[PDB]
Amino acid sequence: PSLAPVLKNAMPAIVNVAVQGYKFESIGSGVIIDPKNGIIITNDHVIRNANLITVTLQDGRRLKARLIGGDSETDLAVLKIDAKNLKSLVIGDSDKLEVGDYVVAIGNPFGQSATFGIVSALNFIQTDAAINPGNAGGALVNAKGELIGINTAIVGIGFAIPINMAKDVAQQIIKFGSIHRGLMGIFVQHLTPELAQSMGYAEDFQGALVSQVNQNSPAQLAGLKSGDVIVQINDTKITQATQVKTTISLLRAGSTAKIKILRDNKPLTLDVEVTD
Amino acid sequence: PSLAPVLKNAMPAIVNVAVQGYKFESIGSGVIIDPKNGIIITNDHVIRNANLITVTLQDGRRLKARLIGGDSETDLAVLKIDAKNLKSLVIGDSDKLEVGDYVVAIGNPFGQSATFGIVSALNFIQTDAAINPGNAGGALVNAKGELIGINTAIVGIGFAIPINMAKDVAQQIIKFGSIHRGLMGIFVQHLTPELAQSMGYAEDFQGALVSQVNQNSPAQLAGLKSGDVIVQINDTKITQATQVKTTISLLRAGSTAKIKILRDNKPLTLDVEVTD
Amino acid sequence: PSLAPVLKNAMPAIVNVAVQGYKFESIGSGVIIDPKNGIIITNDHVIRNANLITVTLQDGRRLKARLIGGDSETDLAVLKIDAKNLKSLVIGDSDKLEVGDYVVAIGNPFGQSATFGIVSALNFIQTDAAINPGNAGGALVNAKGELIGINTAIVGIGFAIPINMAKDVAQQIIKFGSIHRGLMGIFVQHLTPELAQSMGYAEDFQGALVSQVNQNSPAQLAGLKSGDVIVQINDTKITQATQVKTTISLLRAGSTAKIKILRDNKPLTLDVEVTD
């Protein structure tokens, strides 16, 4: 057997990414996620100080890109392409992923490049498939050609970000133009006036909107649902998203934190367990 | 396909090993061999100058260990655990091993870590599976999850000790509290007074007991069986096990060596061919 | 499964190659191509400044070798052995090769050594199978044990020369005692007097014989067939094979080049597109 059949299918979605800033020359790969919107994902540090981000496809179509946004902590960034006809790959679930699963790291450093290995450990994915500068921000796929992760930069040891997590950050960037991680597996956003009155609240109302609560995280289990609004963490008032990361990070691990929330006009309070 | 099914089964037997001496901090992995006795094997240099050897299991049970003994030349050491409920892995035969066989190097450097490759050459096993400090003394297993070797430290090139050989040294350590390799594939031991009269000899009788003769080695083929007793190698008398390695090492390769033995009360003499 | 069955079959054809010159000591591997003629191939730089090239087989038969010739650009060289009984391997087609295909790099650095990986990219073959000094000039084989390439020296990244190309250069060396690469995928040779009158031409006739035109190359598509004879490239006369590489290299990429040829007594002219 071989992987050629299934890599043939993965290939088209993998792009090359050249960056020029200040003169600067950066090169990495990227994966097309939504061809009907022209959306691709690559590493965050590749497009750092980016002045000219140029994407080259498989068919050689050189195109210019628009950084919708990027995330530091996962080293991920999202770009938009204003083009059509694009093809993507079949994408899988990183939840089904187990150590021992075979794995291939693809990229496009020039004008392909695939390395084989397995998953070594399992919030990134460790692998003995050889990742490179040329193929960071590229596609890590399973033995079925399903996209299970995005390559990053760091030995004999590679790391990728599980595509579930990857897609979660891209969406926040797509829907909000940004991404802000608060406490214990939740994502928060600035509760703008227009967002406030989109949720039945007053224009003058302030807080940190919870844009997503990851399942079985301490906050989900502390009872915090998405669409809630934090106004106070302990004896400190909250009025923007960045304050959550700030307030939380200034409290020792495993501490009881009383956080006032506001779910559908009713104020609550949630006792929560701080995680490092 | 994948290896997850079979690595799931291997995992429980793999331990983490933390060592403190003189302040010193050493970390490696190890494999549980006999759960009904609490016996684990790891690398010898990990527990060097060991003052505190602490073992952490899969279920997180941190336990203290007792160095039964260790071997330098194979870089192997044996530890005892005074605990119950333990599970081991399925263990194979290193004789069935051939170059080309797939292979996975597992360890437990933190709190898993598995790398894939094949057997490169075949008295250790060379492999392109990536071994590390974190995963030396850990389990090398075949494509069937059978334990075929123990990882060691040294590139793109790893080495393991064939589990047959590994089990042979552990047993000597278990049965005798030590291990001494004499000439051409044989293992010798101090013929203590209590051992002498356990074999029908006199209390006052002296020699180097042969505790094991490996099959098809020059000494087996020179006719030397286990349970024999060397009293003289050439014109030099023998009275303890260490003298065999000493006497033999001082003779050029492929030399004729006349060794008086004593098998069941009858003295013999064996013409033997020195191997480097 | 495993690869042992199929590596067993490959092994015999793989040789060790030790070189002594000026004191010099070089070591690499090589593959037996034609056992009925005693022909082996290895890397070119291994037998550089070679004064004593000694080959050792699998059965340990140490034999002396005769450098028929070698090629720099592909880093390949051909040696002859004046011996019998030899066995070779099953050899494949590098055209069927695709990225994702599994792959094993074998050699004989001592007295075997095989590493596993896939084809990474595709005029050499890139692979994440680990090549070494010890195993350069050795056999890269597919998952079927078919010889698909010859290992070379250069990271996490190996390179081999597709066996089709490899066999093409060896034959030129075998048939002509040399190899000279002209323009855009063609091979040229000195049109010696004896060769001239072997092709119906006069003894006094001069030019650069085309000893092979690779399919779908610019020159094939420019209409140039093997067995033709170049006498002029542009306004410059041609009288030996080395002049083609010389003339061509002194013209910018993608230029129109008018080359007088002489196919079966009739002069032509061929408009050709220069490739870098």
Determine, for residues B98 and C130 on separate chains, whether the beta-carbon distance falls below 8 Å.
no
Residue with tokens 């033709």: C228
Of the CA atoms within 13 Å of residue C66, those in its CB half-sphere come to 11
Buried b (16+ CB within 10 A) or exposed e, C174-192: bebeebbbbbbbbbbbbbe
Separation in Å, CA of C121 to nearest CA in chain A: 5
Rounded-to-integer distance, Cα B30 and Cα C127, Å: 33
- Chain C interface with A: residues with Cβ < 8 Å: 98-102, 117-118, 120-121, 126, 128, 143, 156-157
Q: Hey, what amino acid is at B17?
A: V
Pick the residue from chain C with its C-alpha nearest to B101.
C2
Determine, for residues A98 and B4 on separate chains, whether the beta-carbon distance falls below 8 Å.
yes
Which CATH number fits the domain B182-276, given the four candidates 1.10.10.10, 1.20.1600.10, 2.30.42.10, 3.50.50.60?
2.30.42.10
Select the residue of A5, A8, A114 nearest C118 (Cβ to Cβ).
A114
Buried b (16+ CB within 10 A) or exposed e, A3-27: bbebbeebbbbbbbbbbeeeeeebb
CB B225 within 8 A of CB B263: yes
Query: Considering only CB atoms, which chain C residues are within 8 Å of A104?
Result: 100, 118
Write out the two tokens for A270: 């949630």
Write out the two tokens for B181: 């390799």
CB B207 within 8 A of CB B238: yes
User: How many residue contacts between A and B have a Cβ separation below 8 Å?
Assistant: 49
Query: Considering only CB atoms, which chain A residues are within 8 Å of C118?
Result: 2-3, 104, 114-116
Give A78-145 as a DSSP string: EEE----S-----B--TTS--TT-EEEEEE-----EEEEEEEEE---EEESS---STTTTSEEE-TTS
**Planar angle of CA B162, B167, B168, nearest 5 degrees:** 100
Determine, for residues C116 and B121 on separate chains, whether the beta-carbon distance falls below 8 Å.
no
Residue C222's closest CA among C237, C233, C238, C236?
A: C233
Select the residue of C98, C101, C121 nearest A113 (Cβ to Cβ).
C121
Pick the residue from chain B with its C-alpha nearest to A157.
B130
Residue B141 forms beta bridges with which residues?
B104, B147
Write out the two tokens for B25: 């901090």
Query: Considering only CB atoms, which chain A residues are within 8 Å of C92?
Result: none
Q: Hey, what amino acid is at B121?
A: A
Rounded-to-integer distance, Cα A54 and Cα A64, Å: 5
Select the residue of B99, B101, B156 nearest C130 (Cβ to Cβ).
B156
Residue C155's closest CA among C134, C121, C132?
A: C132
CB atoms within 10 A of CB C246: 14
Give chain A as a DSSP string: --SHHHHHHHGGGEEEEEEEE----EEEEEEEEETTTTEEEEETTTTTTEEEEEEE-TT--EEE-EEEEEETTTTEEEEE----S-----B--TTS--TT-EEEEEE-----EEEEEEEEE---EEESS---STTTTSEEE-TTS-EEEEE------EEEEEHHHHHHHHHHHHHHS--EE-SSSEEEEE--HHHHTTTT--TT---EEEEEE-TTSHHHHTTPPTT-EE-EETTEE--STHHHHHHHHTS-TT-EEEEEEEETTEEEEEEEE---
Radius of gyration for the alpha carbons in chain A, expressed in angstroms and rounded: 20
Separation in Å, CA of B229 to nearest CA in chain C: 37
Which CATH number fits the domain B1-89, given the four candidates 2.40.10.10, 2.30.140.10, 3.10.105.10, 2.130.10.10?
2.40.10.10
Query: Considering only CB atoms, which chain C residues are within 8 Å of B157?
Result: 130
Q: Hey, what amino acid is at B43?
A: N
Q: Tell me whether domains A1-89 and A90-181 share a fold.
A: yes
Find which of A126, A127, A128, A141 to mutate to test the B interface (most B CBs within 10 Å of its CB). Answer: A128
Query: Considering only CB atoms, which chain C residues are within 8 Å of A130?
Result: 128, 156-157
Rounded-to-integer distance, Cα B127 and Cα B156, Å: 9
Of the CA atoms within 13 Å of residue B11, those in its CB half-sphere come to 19
Query: Considering only CB atoms, which chain C residues are within 8 Å of B99?
Result: 4, 7, 112, 114
CB C54 within 8 A of CB C25: no
Residue C40 three-state SS = strand
Give C248-260 as a DSSP string: HHTS-TT-EEEEE
Q: Hey, what amino acid is at B35?
A: P
Residue C158's closest CA among C192, C194, C133?
A: C133
Separation in Å, CA of A106 to nearest CA in chain C: 9
Determine, for residues B98 and C4 on separate chains, whether the beta-carbon distance falls below 8 Å.
yes
Determine, for residues B116 and A117 on separate chains, whether the beta-carbon distance falls below 8 Å.
yes
- Chain B interface with A: residues with Cβ < 8 Å: 1-8, 104, 112-116, 129-130, 132
Residue A150's closest CA among A58, A43, A69?
A: A43
- Chain C interface with B: residues with Cβ < 8 Å: 1-8, 104, 112-116, 129-130, 132
Select the residue of B7, B114, B130 nearest A156 (Cβ to Cβ).
B130
Residue C182's closest CA among C95, C68, C75, C275?
A: C275
CB atoms within 10 A of CB B89: 22
Buried b (16+ CB within 10 A) or exposed e, C3-32: bbebbeebbbbbbbbbbeeeeeebbbbbbb
**Planar angle of CA B264, B265, B271, nearest 5 degrees:** 80
**A220 φ, ψ (degrees, to nearest 5):** -60, -45
**B243 φ, ψ (degrees, to nearest 5):** -70, -15
Query: Considering only CB atoms, which chain C residues are within 8 Å of B121?
Result: 112-114
- Chain A interface with C: residues with Cβ < 8 Å: 1-8, 104, 112-116, 129-130, 132
Domain ranges for chain B = 1-89, 90-181, 182-276
Query: Helix (H) and strand (E) counts for chain B?
Result: 5, 21
**C26 φ, ψ (degrees, to nearest 5):** -115, 145
Query: Considering only CB atoms, which chain A residues are within 8 Å of C101?
Result: 2-4
Q: Hey, what amino acid is at B221?
A: L
Separation in Å, CA of C63 to nearest CA in chain A: 38
Determine, for residues A113 and C120 on separate chains, whether the beta-carbon distance falls below 8 Å.
yes
Pick the residue from chain C with its C-alpha nearest to B127.
C115
Of the CA atoms within 13 Å of residue B190, those in its CB half-sphere come to 10
| Chains contacting A (3+ CB pairs below 8 angstroms) | B, C
Residue C31's closest CA among C126, C92, C106?
A: C106
Determine, for residues C120 and A132 on separate chains, whether the beta-carbon distance falls below 8 Å.
no
Query: Considering only CB atoms, which chain C residues are within 8 Å of B143?
Result: 1-2
Q: Which residues contact A185 (CB under 8 A, 6 or more apart)?
A: A213, A214, A217, A218, A219, A220, A275
Select the residue of C6, C116, C132 nearest B117 (Cβ to Cβ).
C116
CB atoms within 10 A of CB B67: 16
Pick the residue from chain A with its C-alpha nearest to C143.
A1
Yes or no: domain A90-181 corresponds to CATH 2.40.10.10: yes
For chain A, how many residues are written? 276
Question: What resolution in angstroms, rounded to 1 decimal?
Answer: 2.8
Determine, for residues B99 and C112 on separate chains, whether the beta-carbon distance falls below 8 Å.
yes
Determine, for residues B2 and A121 on separate chains, whether the beta-carbon distance falls below 8 Å.
no
Give C205-251 as a DSSP string: ---EEEEEE-TTSHHHHTTPPTT-EE-EETTEE--STHHHHHHHHTS
